[PDB]
Amino acid sequence: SSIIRKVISTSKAPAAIGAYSQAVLVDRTIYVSGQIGMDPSSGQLVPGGVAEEAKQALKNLGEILKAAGCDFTNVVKTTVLLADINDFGTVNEIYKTYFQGNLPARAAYQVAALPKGSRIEIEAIAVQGPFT
């Protein structure tokens, strides 16, 4: 009856730049904030556009999961928000190398704009787990 609720926080990923936690762990589900390709040390976007931003965002997601005792195998659902729908193939290809087994559910669509003029934001939900 009292379930674990924890603010996940790790200096391996970018500081929060607004009123949000990097992720929240509640019972065994982790809700992860929308990850953009900010460099962890400096907080600004990595340069280079969508491919580099996607890689940094996924690395940032990894480190946040690591701080919640998980890794990319724990992800059950992601949302890929794109500044340009035509980047979807490139991003899928990047995305494949992080997620390589039981793939999360996924939604993906182009938005009108992302924070900081980013080209990609990735949301995720993960579940902690001895899974059967």
Add this chain to the structure above:
Amino acid sequence: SSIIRKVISTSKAPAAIGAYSQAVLVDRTIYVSGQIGMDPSSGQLVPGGVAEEAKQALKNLGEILKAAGCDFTNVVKTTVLLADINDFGTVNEIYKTYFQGNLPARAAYQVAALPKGSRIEIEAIAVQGPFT
């Protein structure tokens, strides 16, 4: 021969997690627990990364000193623990806005992780009473 020993406790700096005291005054020396950039009111790490955190950790240290009848001039030694040694330049400048005149001794290095996913933790030793 029976010396002063006092637990320092203030509402305006992060309350002490179960065990440990915010600071312990013994004779005239104050051992201050490590401070991070946590808002006393919300209990969260302030947003914005190392510079905001360094400021908030120095403010928390200020309030604990104030409850011991001291201020920043009383600090004789600090240890600056960083999540990234490349932040040293930033924090050194911020730190100069608190510490004027008889500047404390210092030791500074990068550690593998800090409480609450913190990017900077400051440990201080102060001494009370009039000098000279």
